[PDB]
Paper text:
The spike (S) glycoprotein of SARS-CoV-2 mediates receptor recognition and viral entry into cells.
The Kappa variant also harbors multiple mutations in the S protein. However, the substitution of the E484 with polar but uncharged Gln (Q) could reduce the original constrain, leading to the outward shift of the T470-F490 loop.
Numbering used by the authors:
A (entry chain A): 19 to 615
B (entry chain E): 333 to 526
The structure:
């Protein structure tokens, strides 16, 4: 009778047609990943275009139904993500120019190699080659050699491609009625239609800039300690009052500082917690690993693995018969099919990663009852964050003594907690200023606040001021440094990694308080507590069917994203660093550079 | 001196799609319901209005065997007083229904690699089905006031939709062959007993 009845009829027709094609497209990528052959490429290409042409065909019909006359919110949200036409709005000529530039940068990133002038016949790629040199080498020049050469060759190739990439993505968003293309990425956090929960696309920038102001007290002392320890290993090449060199940060881009934990460890004579030597003597295999992981989610009340899971999933590298990518990915193929692809080795890290990839599966099985278009994370940052809180539960000394890995007589004290937090402080806190820096840079480029010639000039002004990192060698406008990074040239919005941090500690303080924990938060374990699982499962099943501001209020009891749990989690570390930093200079100036003497 | 032929009803290789659901009249024989219950090869076996131990010795003049194939999570939609797509638009049991419900896992047979599309179900119909009504009409569904004229298009949909079954699907998805038995007493004498 009305447009409402027609819409509910269309969206019902769309759901049962989508499961069949979307399952085909994901299963084809599965058969591509586990078994890599030319025959599997066409199977992924055909099934990938059939799904690409399906959403392209449905979007034409979906725009017929106006969103104005539909009062039902759950129906209104389904058409919202469906009626956005994406790249199809551009002309057919620029349509191929966009995918060409995207496919060109993807090959340059993967096939980009560095070649030493000494023996031009031998060259090295980034992975594994350059990633191993940056991490394990203590030499100044060797670390600088991989830092300059990677951005020298790759930077010259991607820059003329990237300048055209900015113009193309703008004309796409301008026809979508967005102020710029940066607003299109921020459109995931957009909330409208509910009184008091409305969260504007532009409120994100004002909120992130506010939340990052309170992390600086934690990060500046985290920087002053790392600069103090590495100063002994590099007396001439690191200034005490200046910013850290870029290539000394432990890897290529300085994203994760975990590699510095070896030199920056607070206490060397205290034993580090590792379950590796305990697992080898117990001779566990891939089967028993996830059974301990499946046993975890049963203790909180979440449902366990399906019987078809263990049969259809490939949990190990199937020998030399077929080649496969070992990058861990949690696959949701729909139709109640869930698979985890991992190359299993015996380590403490894989066991901690084991809960992560299984954490996503616990999240996907929860909203599986939701309709198709509503199957996703509530925002783009929850889906990754739910897997992170599970890894924090398995890294506590309480849980490792529960399943029998670590000896019961292991003696905890003040020196053990500080050693554990600093590892988590390098990974979790160390990546926040870099992420906020990268996003704030993109957002000013797409908006137009930065002219094309000031890109590299404004970049290293953000490097020095925000993150306190100075370039070891100056770069002119010919190089583009950020383009060489994975997420920059692959067209993936990188703000996900900042929000998952602020969300994981809110869940951590909310779920542990539901478990009635006593004492500091980093010693918390959600095992055996059924209250925590029920409070978490309330959000897990909702998916994106409800606004993320509403679903967040259930779990953490707050409508806004706040950093207060973060400083509460590292509160033991922050109190210890202030005493160690009283003899060290806190802060950095942007005027110093290694190449100016 | 004959056993009711449930052998061909349950062990048949091919059943009907839920809209095609096949009715088979059973009369003038003696049925053993204990071999059904005591087999323990059935996933879900429930009776309504009569106990399985009571129907073992008892006499009903008419026994209808309604067999079809539906999805796992949709089996709970077969019962008196239920809603959903299968209940309203496909196969509808009355509230007074006196019969039993039988379901077992067909995944080893019906589902095949790459999916089996021959199993179909009616996703849209203008109204709800009255108890025990088979409507096989393929006529185009009309969502709005726009004339369909038997061609698909905008606000006109083809009501029959197929279930993809692939052996790798999740268990709830995986096909179950459901056989609904009905029992009544009418003016005719009862030739069927224990
Ligand atoms: C992988 O694919 C190749 C060719 O596509 C095939 O010969 C081989 O048997 C496959 N491996 C497995 C384990 O199925
Ligand atoms: C929207 O429609 C769905 C399905 O028809 C229904 O479950 C939901 O309650 C409706 N929402 C409102 C606010 O009426
Ligand atoms: C998963 O849980 C169900 C019920 O909680 C149980 O029947 C099943 O055996 C469990 N899975 C395994 C592999 O034991
Ligand atoms: C959870 O309970 C089981 C059974 O009581 C016990 O074996 C295990 O150690 C407990 N784990 C924790 C972390 O308390
Ligand atoms: C179907 O065949 C099996 C195999 O012998 C048998 O046990 C079963 O009784 C048969 N079905 C019926 C309804 O008799
Ligand atoms: Zn993940």
């Amino acid at each position: 009778s009305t447009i409402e009845e027609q819409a509910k009829t269309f969206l019902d027709k769309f759901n049962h047609e989508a499961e069949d094609l979307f399952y085909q497209s994901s299963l084809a990528s599965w058969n591509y990943n586990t078994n890599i052959t030319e025959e599997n490429v066409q199977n992924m290409n055909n099934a990938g275009d059939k799904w690409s042409a399906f959403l392209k065909e449905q979007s034409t019909l979906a725009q017929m139904y106006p969103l104005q006359e539909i009062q039902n919110l759950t129906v209104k949200l389904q058409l919202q993500a469906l009626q956005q036409n994406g790249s199809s709005v551009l002309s057919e000529d620029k349509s191929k120019r966009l995918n060409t530039i995207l496919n060109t940068m993807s090959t340059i990133y993967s096939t980009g190699k560095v070649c030493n002038p000494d023996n031009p016949q031998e060259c090295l790629l980034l992975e594994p080659g350059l990633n191993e040199i940056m991490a394990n080498s203590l030499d100044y020049n060797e670390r600088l050699w991989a830092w300059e050469s990677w951005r020298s060759e790759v930077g010259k190739q991607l820059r003329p491609l990237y300048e055209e990439y900015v113009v193309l993505k703008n004309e796409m968003a301008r026809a979508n009625h967005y102020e710029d293309y940066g607003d299109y990425w921020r459109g995931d956090y957009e909330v409208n239609g509910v009184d008091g929960y409305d969260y504007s696309r532009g409120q994100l920038i004002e909120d992130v800039e506010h939340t990052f102001e309170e992390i600086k007290p934690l990060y500046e002392h985290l920087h002053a300690y790392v600069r103090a320890k590495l100063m002994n290993a590099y007396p001439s090449y690191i200034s005490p009052i200046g910013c850290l060199p870029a290539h000394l940060l432990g890897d290529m881009w300085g994203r994760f500082w975990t590699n510095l934990y070896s030199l920056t460890v607070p206490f060397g004579q205290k034993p580090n917690i590792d379950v590796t030597d305990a697992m080898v003597d117990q001779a566990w295999d891939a089967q028993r690993i996830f059974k301990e992981a499946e046993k975890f989610f049963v203790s909180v009340g979440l449902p366990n693995m399906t019987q078809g899971f263990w049969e259809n999933s490939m949990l190990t590298d199937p020998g030399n018969v077929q080649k496969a990518v070992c990058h861990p990915t949690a696959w949701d193929l729909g139709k109640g099919d869930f698979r985890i692809l991992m190359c299993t080795k015996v380590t403490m890290d894989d066991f901690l990663t084991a809960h992560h990839e299984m954490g996503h599966i616990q999240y996907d099985m929860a909203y599986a009852a939701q309709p198709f278009l509503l199957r996703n994370g509530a925002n783009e940052g929850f889906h990754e964050a739910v897997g992170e809180i599970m890894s924090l539960s398995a890294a506590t000394p309480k849980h490792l003594k529960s399943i029998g890995l670590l000896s019961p007589d292991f003696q905890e004290d003040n020196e053990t907690e500080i050693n554990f937090l600093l590892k988590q402080a390098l990974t979790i806190v160390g990546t926040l200023p870099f992420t906020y820096m990268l996003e704030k840079w993109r957002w000013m480029v797409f908006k137009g606040e930065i002219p094309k010639d000031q890109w590299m000039k404004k970049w290293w002004e953000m490097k020095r001021e925000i993150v306190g990192v100075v370039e070891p060698v100056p770069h002119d406008e010919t190089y583009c440094d950020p383009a060489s990074l994975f997420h920059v040239s692959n067209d993936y919005s990188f703000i996900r990694y900042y929000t998952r941090t602020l969300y994981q500690f809110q869940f951590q303080e909310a779920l542990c308080q539901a478990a009635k924990h006593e004492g500091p938060l980093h010693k918390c374990d959600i095992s055996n507590s059924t209250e925590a699982g029920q409070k978490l499962f309330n959000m897990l099943r909702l998916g994106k069917s409800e606004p993320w501001t509403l679903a967040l209020e259930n779990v953490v009891g707050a409508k806004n994203m706040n950093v207060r749990p973060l400083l509460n989690y590292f509160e033991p570390l922050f109190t210890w660093l202030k005493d160690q930093n009283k003899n060290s200079f806190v802060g950095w100036s942007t005027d110093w550079s290694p190449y100016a003497d | 001196t004959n056993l009711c032929p449930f052998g061909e009803v349950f062990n048949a290789t091919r059943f009907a799609s839920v809209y095609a659901w096949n009715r088979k009249r059973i009369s003038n024989c003696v049925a053993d319901y204990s071999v059904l219950y005591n087999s323990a090869s059935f996933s879900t076996f429930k009776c309504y209005g009569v106990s399985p131990t009571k129907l073992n010795d008892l006499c009903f003049t008419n026994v209808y065997a309604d067999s079809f194939v539906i999805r796992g999570d949709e089996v709970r939609q077969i019962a008196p007083g239920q809603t959903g797509k299968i209940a309203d638009y496909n196969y509808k049991l009355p509230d007074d229904f006196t019969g039993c419900v039988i379901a077992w896992n067909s995944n080893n047979l019906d589902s095949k690699v790459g999916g089996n599309y021959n199993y179909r179900y009616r996703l849209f119909r203008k109204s709800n089905l009255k108890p025990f009504e088979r409507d096989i009409s393929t006529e185009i569904y009309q969502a709005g006031s726009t004339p369909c004229n038997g061609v698909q298009g905008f606000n006109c949909y083809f009501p029959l939709q197929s279930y993809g079954f692939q052996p790798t699907n999740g268990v709830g998805y995986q096909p179950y062959r459901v056989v609904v038995l009905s029992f009544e007493l009418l003016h005719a004498p009862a030739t069927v007993c224990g």
